[PDB]
Amino acid sequence: LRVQFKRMKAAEWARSDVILLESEIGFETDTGFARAGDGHNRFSDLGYISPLDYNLLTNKPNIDGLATKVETAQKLQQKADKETVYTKAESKQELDKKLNLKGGVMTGQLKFKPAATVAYSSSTGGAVNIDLSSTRGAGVVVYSDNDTSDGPLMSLRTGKETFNQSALFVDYKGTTNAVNIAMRQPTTPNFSSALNITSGNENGSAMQLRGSEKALGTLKITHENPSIGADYDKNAAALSIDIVKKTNGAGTAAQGIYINSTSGTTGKLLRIRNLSDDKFYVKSDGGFYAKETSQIDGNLKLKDPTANDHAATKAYVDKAISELKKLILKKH
Amino acid sequence: LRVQFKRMKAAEWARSDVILLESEIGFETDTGFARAGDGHNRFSDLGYISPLDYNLLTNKPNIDGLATKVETAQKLQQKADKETVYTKAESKQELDKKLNLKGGVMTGQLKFKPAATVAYSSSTGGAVNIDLSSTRGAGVVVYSDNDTSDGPLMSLRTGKETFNQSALFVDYKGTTNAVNIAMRQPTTPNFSSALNITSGNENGSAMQLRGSEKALGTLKITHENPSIGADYDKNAAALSIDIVKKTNGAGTAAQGIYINSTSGTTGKLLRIRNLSDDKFYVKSDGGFYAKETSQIDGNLKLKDPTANDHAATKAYVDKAISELKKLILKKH
Amino acid sequence: LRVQFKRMKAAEWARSDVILLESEIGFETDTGFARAGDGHNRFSDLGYISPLDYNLLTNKPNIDGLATKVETAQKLQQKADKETVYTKAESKQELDKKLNLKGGVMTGQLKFKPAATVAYSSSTGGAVNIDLSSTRGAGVVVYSDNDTSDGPLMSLRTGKETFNQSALFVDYKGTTNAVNIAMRQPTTPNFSSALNITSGNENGSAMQLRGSEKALGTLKITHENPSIGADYDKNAAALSIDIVKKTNGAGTAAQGIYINSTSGTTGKLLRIRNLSDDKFYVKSDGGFYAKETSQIDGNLKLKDPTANDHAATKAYVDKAISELKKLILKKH
Ligand SMILES: O=C1O[C@H]([C@@H](O)CO)C(O)=C1O
Ligand SMILES: O=C1O[C@H]([C@@H](O)CO)C(O)=C1O
Ligand SMILES: O=C1O[C@H]([C@@H](O)CO)C(O)=C1O
Ligand SMILES: O=C1O[C@H]([C@@H](O)CO)C(O)=C1O
Ligand SMILES: O=C1O[C@H]([C@@H](O)CO)C(O)=C1O
Ligand SMILES: O=C1O[C@H]([C@@H](O)CO)C(O)=C1O
Ligand SMILES: O=C1O[C@H]([C@@H](O)CO)C(O)=C1O
Ligand SMILES: O=C1O[C@H]([C@@H](O)CO)C(O)=C1O
Ligand SMILES: O=C1O[C@H]([C@@H](O)CO)C(O)=C1O
């Protein structure tokens, strides 16, 4: 028996008063689908003759192992965005412009403008502190081999007249010179000095100098003749003094050299030697001595003779004479 | 023919001894599903009258293009986590606190504590090396316009008596002064000096000074009168010396000024002029000269006369007399 | 009626000339599937007796909420890769090696090699600028408590003879000494000085010094005896001069001390005192005075007497005599 089932197009079914008997098959001609009547329900309400429940499907895809927008969105949210952040490269890029503690080269300038915790007294302060007590090198090497410059190598300046610290303080202990300035015979000489001092302060010596030499001078000066011409330097001196007036001045009465022992001293106050042998000096009591014949354009006020090698005085002479003339005058 | 098929609830089927003939339809009344008998298999083992194989489904979703947890987990694992890493901002945030080689402003302090490779002799060492041979600016500018300070602008100090380098070494070549200290007439003057030196070392001159001037003094001093009062500075001197004792001392015998030519010299050893004209001097042989009448509170030991303008000596006089008295005595 | 349907294996169906009548069921015996004839289409072209359209499935999975490779790939592309970027740690790791503006410790060296915008005149230049006008601390503290060192604490050097700036310039205003060097009595003394100057320049005083003291010397020297032995320092001097020759020299003619008032001065040019009381001096007109008896190994050229306390001259004496002898000669 070739059995054929009630049938019409889906849309036609979709509007049939036709109640399929229970378990009677009806057929959707334009789709080929079928449905079994429940004895009591319009065709468009019967379900299919076979399941359509995803659960019952063979060859299910693993949907479970697939990532979900949300899951993937949170997992992304923990991770940093390309620009919010610097490539290892831009990091170096910037880093290499910064000086390191271990050392570097400043092509630019290093201004310092200190806040001053305590300003740290005595050698654990100063904007630059340099402790070399465990190192064999220099503290601050500053040099130039330029031909001309517009400024000096180191300059110190204080602008307020109340300022009360030194510009340079040198507290030195060691076996060589505390401070050494050496100028080298130029090919080109100059008219300036190695150390030049200028003080406007009428209330304080431009340079003050104290020492406690056993066998040496507090200030020692040596003039080397710059040439081999013994007669070359006829005009150099070991020490030159000029007492002078204020530009636009009446004059000056300031003294030349002024020596003194406030404390008192047995030494020669002025001792002058040549070829390491005394030639003139002033004894501490103010007597003077000279190896060689002298001259006074002028007169010598002095005490009458007593010794034979004492100079005569008009008085002594006259009196010697006055005596002879008179004593002679057995011519009574 | 309205055909209806064997039928009972699924659960009822699920336990029927009823073997459906091959290709005979049976019907699950509570689900509407059907199944075809294979002539030999309990109903609950027949499959459906139509496929449920995901593969055969129309409107398949692209499951293939969906990301998978694993895939998405590895791809995430290559990407960096928000905090493990610094925002471009925190990067600057930190970076801007670091001094750069091109220059910056140190609001804080810069201690140096050197390790010392070699400690680098002669001008490619020192913790601070400053080469300005190609620049027209200063080396180290240090100034203050504060009114008071607790420390100096630069200080150098060495604490060990064996220390064997200078505190400041100045090797200078150029056309101006190697070192220049200038003090400016204060509104407020002080009692200190421009350059003050103090040495405790009894074995070395506090300041030693050598030069080879052709036509100039090794040490040159000029005293300017600070006022226009010619009689103002009655008490200044070009150079003042005080020879003095140790606080708590017997005395001192240390000399005042001590001059010498160890090598020997034809020059005036002491030459004193006024208005650029000789007034007193000591000849290199130790003869002295004076333009103006002099005085000795005291006596003058000297050699008998020879010239007419030589001073007389008690002896010479007496003998001249002794002669006349005697020669007169044609009074036989 | 047990109805059974046309049937053969799928593969057998798959090649049947058998046209199923419309809505007549045929059965795939090896699969259990069925199909309804459309009256006109070979069996292998009929579809199933029930849908296989993913859309119509109950228990649909949310495919919509699943992430897609592309979506997930772009969202990943915005996020940075682990190594392209530095962990907050490596960031510090590097950062901590860089000196900060607020302060740090340079274990290494800081060379400076300046480019020079303008080289900045007068106190807003120098590779190191240090302004302490608002701080109470030091400018540049450099010290060492090492025993020996190979270099100094600060050194300045200029290599070109045309160089035209100072090495150290000190423009000072304040109430204490501009520059202070102090050496402390060593346990170990040395033979060097506190300040040593050496100039090769025959065209410029090694040290030049100017000041305008009202009541003080431009250069003040004090020699303290280092011991309490009054007779200890028999050989120290306040100032020692040596005029000397060029190593390999004929001699020198350079003078010892050279004093002058170019401007002219009423002061004593040379005044020597002991226990703060004049003992010898040279009057500005070049007359000299001495408190104590003197001596000249030699002769004294001088002007005839006028006063009684003037020294006699051979001439004066002789003439006094020549007169008496002659005047006596009432012996006619
Ligand atoms: O007497 C001198 O002292 C210095 C130097 O030797 C001292 O460290 C020098 O060059 C002289 O001629
Ligand atoms: O005076 C100079 O210094 C160097 C060299 O002589 C250093 O001793 C040089 O070339 C000069 O002209
Ligand atoms: O002998 C010298 O003459 C000049 C100067 O005194 C001219 O007044 C000078 O510097 C000398 O050493
Ligand atoms: O003679 C002097 O030398 C200095 C300065 O001119 C030198 O560079 C100065 O101020 C003087 O009065
Ligand atoms: O002595 C001073 O320095 C400046 C100015 O005079 C600089 O020449 C100033 O105001 C002072 O009181
Ligand atoms: O003429 C002076 O008197 C004092 C001092 O010598 C007092 O002993 C001094 O410094 C002068 O220059
Ligand atoms: O007269 C002196 O000057 C210095 C110091 O007191 C000046 O700031 C010092 O130590 C002396 O003995
Ligand atoms: O000369 C020295 O300096 C210190 C201490 O005396 C400082 O006043 C020390 O231990 C020395 O040997
Ligand atoms: O009295 C002294 O003798 C030596 C020296 O003049 C030897 O020529 C010296 O330095 C002194 O102060």
From C12's Cα to the closest Cα of chain A, the distance in A is 19
User: Which among B59, B140, B300 is the nearest to C294, CB-wise?
Assistant: B300
The first and second tokens of residue C268, run together, are 């004593």
Residues of A whose CB is below 8 A from B63: 61, 63, 66
The first and second tokens of residue A229, run together, are 């011409």
The first and second tokens of residue A142, run together, are 């500053």
Give the residue, out of C223, C233, C235, C244, with the most ligand 9 atoms within 8 A of its beta carbon, to mutate for a pocket test.
Answer: C235
List the alpha helices (DSSP H) in chain A: 10-13, 69-77, 88-95, 314-328
Chain-chain contact of B243 with C223 (C-beta, under 8 angstroms): yes
Quote the radius of gyration of chain A (alpha carbons, Å). Answer: 59
Rounded to the nearest 10 degrees, what angle do helices B314-328 and A314-328 cross at?
10
* Distance in angstroms (rounded) separating the CA atoms of residues C53 and B60: 8
Q: Tell me which DSSP letter residue C80 carries.
A: P
Atom of ligand 9 nearest to the CA of C235: 1
Contact by Cβ (8 Å): A313, A300: no
Minimal-distance CA residue of chain B relative to A214: B202
Burial B90-113 (b: 16+ CB within 10 A, else e): ebeeebeebbbbebbebbbbbbbb
Measured between alpha carbons, how far is residue B309 from residues A90, A299, A312, B316, C314 in Å? Answer: 100, 11, 13, 14, 6
DSSP string for B247-299: SS-S----EEEEEE-SS--SS-SEEEESSSSEEEEE-TTS-EEESS-EEESS-
Atom of ligand 5 nearest to the CA of B186: 1
Backbone φ, ψ for residue A192 (5° rounding): -90, 180
Ligand 5 midpoint to CA C170 (Å): 15
Residues of A whose CB is below 8 A from B32: 35-36, 38, 46-49
Question: Which ligand minimizes its atom distance to the CA of C189?
Answer: 8
Closest-CA residue to C47 (of A34, A14, B24, A1):
A34
Half-sphere CA count of C177, side-chain side, radius 13 A: 16
Number of helices (H), then strands (E), belonging to chain C: the values are 4, 20
The first and second tokens of residue A265, run together, are 């001293």
Contact by Cβ (8 Å): A306, B300: no
Closest-CA residue to C322 (of C330, C332, C331, C314):
C314
C44 part of contact set with chain B, CB < 8 Å = no
Burial A107-134 (b: 16+ CB within 10 A, else e): bbbbbbbbebeebbeebebbbbbbbbbe
Strand, helix or coil for residue C321: helix
Strand, helix or coil for residue B74: helix
Sign of CA dihedral A65, A68, A70, A74: positive
Task: Name the β-bridge partners of C104.
Answer: B110
* Distance in angstroms (rounded) separating the CA atoms of residues B112 and B115: 10
Cα–chain-centroid distance for residue B113? 12
Specify the length of chain B in residues.
332
Residues of B whose CB is below 8 A from A311: 299-300, 302, 311-314
- C-beta atoms surrounding A75 within 10 Å: 19
Residues of B whose CB is below 8 A from C235: 254-255
Domain residue extents for chain B: 1-332
The first and second tokens of residue A10, run together, are 């889906």
**Torsion region of C71: left, alpha or beta (phi above 0 gives left; psi -120 to 50 gives alpha):** alpha
* Distance in angstroms (rounded) separating the CA atoms of residues C2 and C5: 10
Chain-chain contact of C234 with B256 (C-beta, under 8 angstroms): no
A2 part of contact set with chain B, CB < 8 Å = no
Sign of CA dihedral C246, C250, C254, C256: positive
Pairing of the two strands C237-244 and B255-260: parallel
* Distance in angstroms (rounded) separating the CA atoms of residues B204 and A180: 14
Pairing of the two strands A25-28 and A33-36: antiparallel
Closest-CA residue to B135 (of A74, C127, C315):
C127
CA angle C90-C95-C98, nearest 5°? 145
Sign of CA dihedral C118, C122, C126, C132: negative
Half-sphere CA count of C209, side-chain side, radius 13 A: 28
B123 part of contact set with chain A, CB < 8 Å = yes
* Distance in angstroms (rounded) separating the CA atoms of residues C45 and C179: 115
Closest-CA residue to C260 (of A66, B270, B318):
B270
User: Which among B86, B207, B308 is the nearest to C195, CB-wise?
Assistant: B207
Burial class (CB in 10 A: 0-12, 13-18, 19+), C277: exposed
* Distance in angstroms (rounded) separating the CA atoms of residues A174 and C183: 9
Is C55 annotated as ligand-binding? Answer: no
Backbone φ, ψ for residue A55 (5° rounding): -60, -35
Contact by Cβ (8 Å): A272, A281: yes
Burial class (CB in 10 A: 0-12, 13-18, 19+), A158: buried
Interface of A with C in 297-326 (CB under 8 A): 297-304, 311-318, 321, 324-325
Rounded to the nearest 10 degrees, what angle do helices C314-328 and B314-328 cross at?
10
A290 part of contact set with chain C, CB < 8 Å = yes
Which are the contacts of B138, defined by CB distance < 8 A and separation ≥ 6? A151, A152, A153, A154, A155, B132, C119, C120, C125, C126, C127
The first and second tokens of residue B330, run together, are 């044609």
- C-beta atoms surrounding B304 within 10 Å: 16
From A278's Cα to the closest Cα of chain C, the distance in A is 12
* Distance in angstroms (rounded) separating the CA atoms of residues A60 and C282: 129
Please count the residue pairs, one from chain B and one from chain C, whose beta carbons lie less than 8 angstroms apart. 871
The first and second tokens of residue B22, run together, are 């091959």
Minimal-distance CA residue of chain C relative to B209: C197
**Nearest residue by C-alpha to atom 7 in ligand 7:** B192
Ligand 7 midpoint to CA A114 (Å): 30
List the alpha helices (DSSP H) in chain C: 10-13, 69-77, 88-95, 314-328
Ligand 5 midpoint to CA A163 (Å): 12
Atom of ligand 9 nearest to the CA of A217: 12
Ligand 2 midpoint to CA C127 (Å): 25
Half-sphere CA count of A134, side-chain side, radius 13 A: 6
Contact by Cβ (8 Å): B152, A165: yes
Burial B208-238 (b: 16+ CB within 10 A, else e): bbbbbbbebbbbbbbbbbbbebbebbbbbbb
User: Which among B47, B181, B272 is the nearest to C286, CB-wise?
Assistant: B272
Chain-chain contact of C100 with B104 (C-beta, under 8 angstroms): no
* Distance in angstroms (rounded) separating the CA atoms of residues A207 and B209: 14
Q: Tell me which DSSP letter residue C284 carries.
A: T
List the alpha helices (DSSP H) in chain B: 10-13, 69-77, 88-95, 314-328
Contact by Cβ (8 Å): A87, C85: yes
Q: Tell me which DSSP letter residue C66 carries.
A: B
C100 part of contact set with chain A, CB < 8 Å = no
User: Which among C77, C170, C301 is the nearest to A156, CB-wise?
Assistant: C170
Looking up tokens 């200063």 gives B138
CA angle B254-B255-B258, nearest 5°? 135
Strand, helix or coil for residue C77: helix
Ranges of beta strands (E only) in chain B are 6-8, 25-28, 33-36, 103-106, 109-112, 128-131, 140-144, 154-158, 168-172, 179-183, 195-199, 207-211, 217-224, 237-244, 255-260, 270-273, 278-282, 288-290, 294-296, 300-302
* Distance in angstroms (rounded) separating the CA atoms of residues C22 and C326: 198
Closest-CA residue to C202 (of C163, C254, C241):
C254
Task: Name the β-bridge partners of B181.
Answer: A197, C170
Strand, helix or coil for residue B87: strand
Sign of CA dihedral A94, A95, A101, A104: negative
- C-beta atoms surrounding A185 within 10 Å: 14
* Distance in angstroms (rounded) separating the CA atoms of residues B184 and C174: 9
Measured between alpha carbons, how far is residue A202 from residues A148, A252, B115, C259 in Å? Answer: 35, 13, 48, 21
Looking up tokens 């100090």 gives B157
Amino acid identity, position C80: A
Amino acid identity, position A331: K
* Distance in angstroms (rounded) separating the CA atoms of residues B58 and A269: 129
Q: Is A123 in the pocket of ligand 8 (CB under 6 A)?
A: no
Closest-CA residue to A254 (of C270, B281, B236, C241):
B236
Q: Is A187 in the pocket of ligand 2 (CB under 6 A)?
A: yes
Atom of ligand 9 nearest to the CA of A276: 8
Ligand 4 midpoint to CA A192 (Å): 8
Contact by Cβ (8 Å): A228, C248: yes
